[PDB]
Design a protein around this nucleic acid. Structure first.
Lengths: 219, 220
RNA sequence: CGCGAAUUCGCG
RNA sequence: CGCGAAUUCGCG
RNA sequence: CGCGAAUUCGCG
RNA sequence: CGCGAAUUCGCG
């Protein structure tokens, strides 16, 4: 009966229960009816609900000031934040031990793609219920100026957490002429190394740090 | 009928605030205090939604795999220009001299709809409908029949087979990721110039790389 | 131009 | 293989 | 692309 | 066995 518990937590009641459930079903539970298709529509939806809220309550309206914020606002970390409010995780139907933050976030999106559709695709209405429940935390995030931590910083905290050691960004080359230069640095921790390329030294490093983070997720 | 009214007619909507429509039309290089920078930001997320809700709904295959490719194209600037010309708005953009390219047009396309959205008093359902009413048919066509991607490898295949009488050579650089979702990074060389390209297949990668090598060769 | 081929690329 | 493009060669 | 196969990997 | 991502080979 958890079906009619999450609804009384959203402030809406699905006229089509199968749809709601579907947006909560992971492919590893029903290969024929999972939230994949919905997550796709949810992403587009929620992004619009946020951006409209960002260009509206932001102290600065220049793209260069909004982009950085939006990155956070539509980031997985944040969707889990909002999803957490709904206690969403304990409402997902998935095989024991496969659930994570990426799935939650996904489900969170597909959830609203569900409401939107189940209400006859009433953008305006679906948007309101979204704010009713989340507008506050969004305006707070924007006020606080929350932003996505850069890769170089993330890599450092990761490698320091594990091996109490920082990375080392050795410079290996430069191609393009003074007009349009291209750097190639080697990010390295222990014996793992990735390569980054970009306009400036810092830029390249970020590239390398990002790729090196991936390389460290499986190890 | 003035420019605005002449467009508002093709648009199928008349703003209850001319100022707003202006803002979504002028370019920074015409008004530093009142351009469309902020409106384009909003219009992008807005237009994205309209197009995606339409995609997922009428697209045959509704798989994450197939949809993504489409979506990219449907929101691609080259594709917006086609929608843009349907309104031939590239005649109402308030910009100075020749600086206007097929990017300032798409951006104005977005911003416009944001203006239509805001003006309607933030009426999504309305603005959305007005949108479909003018581009629904087009999008669907683009969706159904599918896309016809650019053959960068062959077009470049000549740019060099003539400008140098020699064909370009492609050299693989590195592959990564799980063996069920690999990421190829190949290199494209021509005479003395070189560029890279990423993708999920040696070909798609050679296509991405062959691309830059063109939008760089015609630079020197 | 038409026919028949070689080579490269892409599409089906 | 078919089809299309580019370079090339041969015949008409 | 079509047909016939080999290999690696993910899913059922 | 079956579905999907990738890399090759033969035939059309």
């Amino acid at each position: 009966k958890m079906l009619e518990q999450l609804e009384k937590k959203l402030g809406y009641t699905f006229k089509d229960k199968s749809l709601l459930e579907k947006a909560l079903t992971h492919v590893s539970y029903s290969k024929k009816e999972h939230y994949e298709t919905l997550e796709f529509l949810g992403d587009a939806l929620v992004n619009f609900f946020i951006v409209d809220l960002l260009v509206q309550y932001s102290p600065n309206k220049r793209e260069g000031f909004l982009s950085p914020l939006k990155a956070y606002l539509i980031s997985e970390e944040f969707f889990n934040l909002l999803a957490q409010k709904l206690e969403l995780h304990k409402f997902i139907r998935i095989k024991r031990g496969k659930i994570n933050e990426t799935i939650i976030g996904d489900v969170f999106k597909a959830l609203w793609a569900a409401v939107y559709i189940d209400s006859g695709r009433d953008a305006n209405f679906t948007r309101e219920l979204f704010y009713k429940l989340f507008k506050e935390d969004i305006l707070s995030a924007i006020k606080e100026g929350r932003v996505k931590k850069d890769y170089k910083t993330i890599l450092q905290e990761i490698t320091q957490k594990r091996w109490k050691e920082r990375p080392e960004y050795r410079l290996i080359s430069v191609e393009g002429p003074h007009h349009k230069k291209k750097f190639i640095v080697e990010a390295k921790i222990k014996e793992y190394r990735t390569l980054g390329e970009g306009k400036s030294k810092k830029e390249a490093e970020q590239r390398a740090a990002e790729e090196l983070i991936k390389l460290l997720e499986e190890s």
